[PDB]
Structures are given as structure tokens and as C-alpha cells.
């Protein structure tokens, strides 16, 4: 079922919630730009995972998602076994973000297929950073990682440098963040510690706006020259022009606008 860009009263919330209850057969939910209507997002939430389901992708995507949404979820997060994908991005939580995100983190322990997984954007998801990262070692089979929009320190990029040490990932191929903060000391802070990762595909390493220092932008063009993949990379808000364009190795293309 793929429901995309569909405009709703708010109220058809709790219609919509008990079609999909009769859904038994459901695998795929997708949804997606569920307008906004704020009252409700948690019928939607609710009608799933709530009696044993089988659904192996549930994106929920631009739908406008609560604290109280995500709460729900997790808290029936007791089954859904054989559930791969879960996104949840592109929902700011404005509010009690951080005791949703918390919910989240100490479980999906039961989800074993659980990979290529993205978080729910909010304040302030930085806080459980650490937390997040110790349990996603658990999972090997992890492919793709989504911690996009929330800023970024200088430190917390380091953390991650360590996370990507590390026992080996194999067939982590993406990378999803859409904003961050840099400077001259990062992404030259971990640079080098993604040529352990060759299999990636690609990624968006993206901020607000700053100019690469020339010992990044050529040791950039180093780790992207021994990637085996690399197919469009994507480093949105960076002031890379025709200069730092000859000093970059051979690529698909490059995303910096």
C-alpha cells in the first residue's frame, strides 16, 4: 500500500486506521507526505503493530510524527518480527524528543532483521548518539544509516570516526545525513576512516555552508578514488568549485548545491 502526497481532513485519520486493521495481509506500508494534520498521526501508528503483524517495510515519511507517536510504537514494538525497514525521518519532534528517542533506542532488541534504518529527526536525538551506536554494533547486517538534519558538533563526528573503526560492517553502503557542522578539523577529524567501507553506494556528509580545506579536499579525492561503488556522492552545502573539482578523483558525479 503506497499512499503519497495524500491530502486528509485529519478526522478520515481514524477511517483510514481501521481500513488498514483489515489488512492481514499487509507487508508494505509506505505512506509517505501524509499532508499535516497533527491529530491523528497516531491513529495511523496505532493501527499497526498493535495485534501481531507481519509487515516487513513501514516508511513514514514527511507525515508529520509526534513524540507521542513514536512513544506508541515503541512501546508496541513486541512483534513486527521480520521487519527490515523502518524510517520515521523527516518528522521533526519539536518537543519530548529526547524521551521518545530514548524509547526507541532501548528496544528494537526482538527486530533481528532490523537494517538500512534511519531515525526520527527531533530535539535532541544527539543526546542518545553513544547509546545509538553501541547497540548498532550489535547488528552486523546494518547497510544503511540515517542520522540527517539535527546538528552536529566537532565531537560527535569523532564518535562516529570510532563507530566506523570497527569490527567490520561489509555491506554498509549508505550513508544519510543531511546536516552537519565542519570546520578544519573534521570531516578531517574521521576522514579515512570510511576507506575501510569500500562497498559504499553513497552518501550525504551535507551541512550549511563552508569551503573544504585543500588537505581535505585531496584527501577526499584519495578516499573516493579507492571506493568501489561511489555511485553519485552527495556532499550538499559545501563550496567546492572548478579547483577543488580538478583536485577530486573520477566519480559518477558530485552533489555540493
Known sequence: ????NIKMNEEDAIKLAEGLKNLKKMCLFHLTHLSDIGEGMDYIVKSLSS???DLEEIQLVS???SANAVKILAQNLHNLVKLSILDLSENYLEKDGNEALHELIDRMNVLEQLT???LPWGCDVQGSLSSLLKHLEEVPQ???LGLKNWRLTDTEIRIL???FGKNPLKNFQQLNLAGNRVSSDGWLAFMG????LKQLVFFDFSTKEFLPDPALVRKLSQVLSKLTFLQEARLV????DDDDLSVITGAFKLVTA
Open 1 to 4: 500500500l503506497i499512499m503519497d
Open 51 to 53: 495485534e501481531p503483524c
Open 63 to 65: 507525515c508529520c510524527l
Open 116 to 118: 538500512a534504518l534511519m
Open 142 to 144: 546494518l547497510v544503511k
Open 161 to 163: 570516526g570510532a563507530f
Open 193 to 196: 576512516v570510511f576507506e575501510n
Open 237 to 240: 552545502g559545501w563550496q567546492f
